[PDB]
Amino acid sequence: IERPNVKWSCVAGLEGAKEALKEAVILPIKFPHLFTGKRTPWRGILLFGPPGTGKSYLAKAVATEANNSTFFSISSSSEKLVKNLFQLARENKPSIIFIDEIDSLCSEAARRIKTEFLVQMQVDNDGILVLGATNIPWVLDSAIRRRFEKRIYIPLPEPHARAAMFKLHLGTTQNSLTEADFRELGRKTDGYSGADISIIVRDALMQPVRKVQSATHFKKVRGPSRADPNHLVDDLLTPCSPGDPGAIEMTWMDVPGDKLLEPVVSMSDMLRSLSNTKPTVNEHDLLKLKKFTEDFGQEG
């Protein structure tokens, strides 16, 4: 329906999962004549691991890289909607279907309606591949589990990958972090999820705006004009502390919209929000993934 645009370079770490998804998804689409007869792409791939390890984000990256294929990102949030889901799949080949939080399935009447998904997997399906993703792979019943013949564990990020993701979640916003800073944020965040890092920087991003909304004084300052970044101007105002040279008793209401110079995102800012959040994952939840990682292996 709509095409994602995530490049390989943008996803941090996950080098192992990239090589397997290249071997299982991308290389067969670009080179169909290699996968003939005995070898054809697996019917469905299952991504499992701790929450916020990039499983869903990795699904968008693999969808962007085939380009020839089409991306149908259906949510975990009705059999005629999936009958046409596979019907529109087979008309446009090659194609892939990502089902985030596929632990959805597996007490209730909706339980009965869950059978419509397995009809399609085993009809003619060649250019269609189903990406499954979940954080609790064990609750999944055996009928779908035997259907994803390839299962990939997405691990917690490594220090280099966490340092990257602190830089990536910043984007183009004004900050004063050095490359040596990002590396230091990697070491201090051991066991932190990918979602956990995204939580930290959004709070750190909100401290400039909080400083503006709370400042009782502003100081005139030089800087690039908000109309043209190439022309330095002098009438800009930035939050100051009540005693700095040039303090003016005024709040953000008295600052014109085009005269505010935003304060930069510090490193102490990011450390201040790092200290206020702790890793979501626990050691118990991971060894339960260890239980799944060995009981069934790849297709058992």
Ligand SMILES: *CCC(=O)Nc1cccc(Nc2nc3c(-c4ccccc4)cccn3n2)c1
């Ligand atoms: C090239 C532009 C771009 O895509 N930047 C960007 C911004 C945020 C994150 C990433 N890559 C990335 N995200 C993750 C996660 C993750 C983050 C947030 C929430 C859930 C998961 C986990 C693991 C790896 N990873 N890379 C790129």
